Design a protein around this ligand. Structure first.
Ligand code: MG
Ligand code: MG
Ligand code: MG
Ligand code: MG
Ligand code: MG
Ligand code: MG
Ligand code: MG
Ligand code: MG
Ligand code: MG
Ligand code: MG
Ligand code: MG
Ligand code: MG
Ligand code: MG
Ligand code: MG
Ligand code: MG
Ligand code: MG
Ligand code: MG
Ligand code: MG
Ligand code: MG
Ligand code: MG
Ligand code: MG
Ligand code: MG
Ligand code: MG
Ligand code: MG
Ligand code: MG
Ligand code: MG
Ligand code: MG
Ligand code: MG
Ligand code: MG
Ligand code: MG
Ligand code: MG
Ligand code: MG
Ligand code: MG
Ligand code: MG
Ligand code: MG
Ligand code: MG
Ligand code: MG
Ligand code: MG
Ligand code: MG
Ligand code: MG
Ligand code: MG
Ligand code: MG
Ligand code: MG
Ligand code: MG
Ligand code: MG
Ligand code: MG
Ligand code: MG
Ligand code: MG
Ligand code: MG
Ligand code: MG
Ligand code: MG
Ligand code: MG
Ligand code: MG
Ligand code: MG
Ligand code: MG
Ligand code: MG
Ligand code: MG
Ligand code: MG
Ligand code: MG
Ligand code: MG
Ligand code: MG
Ligand code: MG
Ligand code: MG
Ligand code: MG
Ligand code: MG
Ligand code: MG
Ligand code: MG
Ligand code: MG
Ligand code: MG
Ligand code: MG
Ligand code: MG
Ligand code: MG
Ligand code: MG
Ligand code: MG
Ligand code: MG
Ligand code: MG
Ligand code: MG
Ligand code: MG
Ligand code: MG
Ligand code: MG
Ligand code: MG
Ligand code: MG
Ligand code: MG
Ligand code: MG
Ligand code: MG
Ligand code: MG
Ligand code: MG
Ligand code: MG
Ligand code: MG
Ligand code: MG
Ligand code: MG
Ligand code: MG
Ligand code: MG
Ligand code: MG
Ligand code: MG
Lengths: 88, 100, 92, 62
RNA sequence: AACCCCCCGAAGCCAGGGAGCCAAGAAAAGCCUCUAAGCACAACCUGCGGGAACCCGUACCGCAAACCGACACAGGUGGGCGG
RNA sequence: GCCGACCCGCGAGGGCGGCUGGAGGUAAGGGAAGUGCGAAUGCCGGCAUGAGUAACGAUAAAGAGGGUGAGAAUCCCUCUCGCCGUAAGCCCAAGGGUUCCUACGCAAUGGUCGUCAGCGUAGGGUUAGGCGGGACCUAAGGUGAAGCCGAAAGGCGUAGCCGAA
RNA sequence: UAGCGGGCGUGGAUCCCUGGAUGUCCGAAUGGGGGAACCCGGCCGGCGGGAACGCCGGUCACCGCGCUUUUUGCGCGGGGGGAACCUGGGGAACUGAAACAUCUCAGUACCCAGAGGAGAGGAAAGAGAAAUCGACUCCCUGAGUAGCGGCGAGCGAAAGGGGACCAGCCUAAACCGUCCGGCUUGUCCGGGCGGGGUCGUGGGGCCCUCGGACACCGAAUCCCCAGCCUAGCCGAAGCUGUUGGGAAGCAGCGCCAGAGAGGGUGAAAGCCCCGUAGGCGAAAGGUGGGGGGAUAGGUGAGGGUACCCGAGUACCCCGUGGUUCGUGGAGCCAUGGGGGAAUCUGGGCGGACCACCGCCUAAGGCUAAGUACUCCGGGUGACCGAUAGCGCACCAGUACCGUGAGGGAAA
């Protein structure tokens, strides 16, 4: 799947196998296929509650940066899912 | 609506066919069919009657409705096209030159 | 909204059969409870009903020309009026 | 013509009024029922008494 | 009207009966009981009295001429009684 | 549209006459095309042939008197005869959906006939605290707050809810 | 839609337009359930003698956003439908190549989500060779050109030129004031609101020096109007013979024409009827910058300063997509994986690469018109005339056929 700071769907794009030189010609065997977001869970503290985070390895940082933004954010009163909604 | 036309309960000449010439009070106008009734076409219904009630019901040569177009309205000068003229308040129908 | 549950009386040897006893049967409205046919005929013929009985009358299917029909459905209720009481209104 | 007359008099039902919009209706309906009983037995009805009543009531119901 | 004797007699009833066996044989509510919160002028329980008790089905066919088989089709159709 | 033994044309055609028909038609000269059918086991419809032929659907089986009626092998009644009788009798459930009962009726339906009918027209007819089901329970299963997963559509799924012979 | 039985209309009925009312039950279907049109409830009122029973009025689904003291709450919104058009996500095969695999069919068929009277796109990190152009979309052309291609079959641009339409805007960041909370109380840090700022002849912040108010510009928002839409109304001029069942035919003498389109009337009618030409009309609803008005907004020159100018982004490499581009010398745009900057001595592009020259300012958003379609209304046809034309001129998506998706007449 995709969402989070991330914002990256899995796209589908074809993998085309070739047989060849480069320096005599270069030929084939094409065929479609799915290509995924490296994407991981990010457990993290944030007020009360451990809030977690399906996200692209590429963007692990943005989460941490966004934990920071929230120190300067008013929240408590039991909000585990809701906290996450609040982030950004 | 729209179904309206030439005349109504009043007096009329018949420039028709069988009764070409004859003049008479239109005892009937039915617009759904477009047909008036004077005393022109009045043909014979051999028929006893349709409904059993009232034993006998008439061979009556009753008045066969007319194509509302074969009759014309009429005044001092007989048989005129109708004009519509507006008074000071309403709509009264002057004739080829006369009125009423 | 009360002279609405009662529709009209049913007229049939069999209907009459039970006038003699305490039993007035009539066409009610199809969505009527027995609890309502009661307070209905009660406030309508100024009697007390001790007993209501009901049944639907699946409507027969008539026809005409090619055009194939279907008569509307109904619901006789039959009321058992407190002992002695009667409804002259119906006893013609 | 039946309109003008009744309806005017019908807000004239304003001594007590909605209460009477109502009271009247109730009476109007009993009539309808009495009327369609007469209707069904045959030997006591002449038609439009019915229509006319139903419509009193649609107007009354206003 | 009589409506009484005698005999046979179940696979049904008493039923959650008994015995043996191995392949080891539903759940949940009703019902009973225990207490918690809450109440103990309530509330439960038993008797009696008075009252209240809706909605839908209920015709008819149903081993077939009324169901499934284009047909009043020698086919097909679960359960009970079957002297 | 029908008929012609006439006229013109090499011919496809055109003309003329008679009868039917009863409200449209469209010169000369040009234009444009859904433009000519005998065949496609062609498509639709009609009507033939086989042929008054095969069949009339269980070999349980008939007969007579009387009645009804325009009309009865075929409907009603009576007597005799035959067949079923762990059924070809009787009560449930399913499916069917007015086929139930009356009254009138026979065009078609009925493999013949029909006065009869399961057929046409009309009127009636189905009554429940206690039978069955719902204002009860749960089964497989289904659905499904949470939760998990999936490009979208969606998948899985706790509690609960639905689900019964 | 005749009939039986009764009524209503110049005290303007029927009927037509506009607004309102009522509007069972099901259906997004939403109190709960469910085998759609049925069943069962909680709460607050009401009805019956009415506690038990029943009915009546109201109200109670779920999600998202905002506000609120966790919460309970309160408001605004969403859900479903739509002939075709449109956009995004996904996406074939027959077939062609006279086999076939690349390639083709085709980003087509279809499935899915969304949009709407359209949708998209849209104010250059552009074009590409002219020190030129100047958003976007559409048509003509360029051009079957440039190219792509088992250089097979095939595929196939752009710039420019001629047209239609015409329009440009808001922000992020620096910087200032503020309020809130986090805390290591700091000239801070973060979040929210306000101001300020919006560009490529680079621009803005801040700091200096100067003339701007009464300058004028001005909507895509709002207000009024016109006009238009939804009922209508006025409208010219003919009569007599005559054959005929019937004139409108034939005959005689007339007339009208801003009207000799068309239809009907017993056959063949400018003058009989309905129309036609021309012209008039809206209380009500809809539409409406076309005209007017108003508001939001907007607009200066020099110098210094080097504070800011959209980050997992540019950029590079790996894997792919788009493009005329099929790995090709393969850029450009886009992006799944890895590494990973700078803020105008910044960056991107001009088909590897480098140097030069020149163009443009990415990583936020919005924008009418020109365009597409046709369920709907109307107009017209060298369009059909009942085996045609829609499957349906007729009671047809019916009868009938299929468990069902679905098929589908006749007349
Ligand atoms: Mg951990
Ligand atoms: Mg990385
Ligand atoms: Mg005439
Ligand atoms: Mg029948
Ligand atoms: Mg008791
Ligand atoms: Mg029964
Ligand atoms: Mg059988
Ligand atoms: Mg059958
Ligand atoms: Mg038989
Ligand atoms: Mg068997
Ligand atoms: Mg036995
Ligand atoms: Mg001829
Ligand atoms: Mg012609
Ligand atoms: Mg020509
Ligand atoms: Mg052809
Ligand atoms: Mg042809
Ligand atoms: Mg041929
Ligand atoms: Mg053959
Ligand atoms: Mg023969
Ligand atoms: Mg023989
Ligand atoms: Mg024989
Ligand atoms: Mg036999
Ligand atoms: Mg034998
Ligand atoms: Mg015999
Ligand atoms: Mg006799
Ligand atoms: Mg006789
Ligand atoms: Mg006799
Ligand atoms: Mg047996
Ligand atoms: Mg029948
Ligand atoms: Mg019976
Ligand atoms: Mg017969
Ligand atoms: Mg026969
Ligand atoms: Mg037969
Ligand atoms: Mg008889
Ligand atoms: Mg007879
Ligand atoms: Mg008989
Ligand atoms: Mg009892
Ligand atoms: Mg209830
Ligand atoms: Mg889980
Ligand atoms: Mg349950
Ligand atoms: Mg309202
Ligand atoms: Mg509803
Ligand atoms: Mg519901
Ligand atoms: Mg209740
Ligand atoms: Mg209540
Ligand atoms: Mg009391
Ligand atoms: Mg609410
Ligand atoms: Mg406060
Ligand atoms: Mg929608
Ligand atoms: Mg399209
Ligand atoms: Mg091929
Ligand atoms: Mg080939
Ligand atoms: Mg070929
Ligand atoms: Mg697509
Ligand atoms: Mg929309
Ligand atoms: Mg448009
Ligand atoms: Mg647009
Ligand atoms: Mg857009
Ligand atoms: Mg810009
Ligand atoms: Mg751009
Ligand atoms: Mg210039
Ligand atoms: Mg080759
Ligand atoms: Mg292509
Ligand atoms: Mg134009
Ligand atoms: Mg144009
Ligand atoms: Mg601002
Ligand atoms: Mg700052
Ligand atoms: Mg500040
Ligand atoms: Mg202050
Ligand atoms: Mg501002
Ligand atoms: Mg001032
Ligand atoms: Mg202005
Ligand atoms: Mg003259
Ligand atoms: Mg004419
Ligand atoms: Mg007017
Ligand atoms: Mg006007
Ligand atoms: Mg405009
Ligand atoms: Mg001004
Ligand atoms: Mg200003
Ligand atoms: Mg300077
Ligand atoms: Mg990257
Ligand atoms: Mg690059
Ligand atoms: Mg490519
Ligand atoms: Mg490529
Ligand atoms: Mg290649
Ligand atoms: Mg380059
Ligand atoms: Mg990338
Ligand atoms: Mg270059
Ligand atoms: Mg250089
Ligand atoms: Mg149209
Ligand atoms: Mg049209
Ligand atoms: Mg047809
Ligand atoms: Mg035909
Ligand atoms: Mg049609
Ligand atoms: Mg069938």
């Amino acid at each position: 799947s995709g969402k989070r700071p991330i914002v990256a769907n899995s796209i589908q794009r074809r993998g085309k196998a070739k047989r060849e030189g480069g320096v005599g010609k270069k030929t084939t065997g094409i065929s479609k296929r799915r290509q995924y977001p490296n994407l991981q869970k990010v457990r993290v503290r944030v007020a009360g509650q451990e809030i977690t985070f399906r996200v692209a390895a590429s963007h692990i940082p943005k989460v941490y940066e966004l934990v920071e933004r929230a120190k300067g954010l008013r929240l408590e009163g039991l909000s585990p899912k809701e906290i996450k909604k609040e982030l950004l | 609506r729209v179904k309206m036309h030439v005349k109504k309960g009043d007096t009329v000449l018949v420039a028709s066919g069988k009764y070409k010439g004859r003049v008479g009070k239109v005892k009937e106008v039915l617009p759904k069919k477009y047909a008036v009734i004077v005393e022109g076409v009045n043909i014979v219904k051999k028929a006893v009657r349709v409904s059993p009630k009232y034993p006998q019901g008439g061979f009556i040569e009753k008045e066969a409705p007319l194509h509302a177009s074969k009759v014309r309205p009429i005044c001092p000068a007989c048989g005129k096209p109708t004009r519509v003229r507006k008074k000071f308040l309403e709509n009264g129908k002057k004739i080829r030159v006369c009125a009423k | 909204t009360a002279y609405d549950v009662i529709l009209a009386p049913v007229l049939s040897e069999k209907a009459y059969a039970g006038f003699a006893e305490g039993k007035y049967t009539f066409w009610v409205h199809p969505k009527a409870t027995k609890t309502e046919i009661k307070n209905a005929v009660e406030t309508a013929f100024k009697v007390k009903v001790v007993k209501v009985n009901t049944l639907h009358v699946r409507g027969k299917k008539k026809r005409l020309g090619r055009y194939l029909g279907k008569r509307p459905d109904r619901k006789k209720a039959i009321v058992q009026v407190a002992p002695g009481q009667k409804i002259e209104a119906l006893e013609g | 013509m039946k309109l003008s007359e009744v309806r005017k008099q019908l807000e004239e039902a304003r001594k007590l009024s909605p209460v009477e919009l109502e009271k009247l209706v109730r009476e109007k309906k009993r009539e309808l029922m009495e009327l369609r009983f007469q209707a069904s037995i045959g030997q006591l009805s002449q038609n439009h008494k019915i229509r006319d009543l139903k419509r009193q009531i649609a107007r009354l119901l206003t």
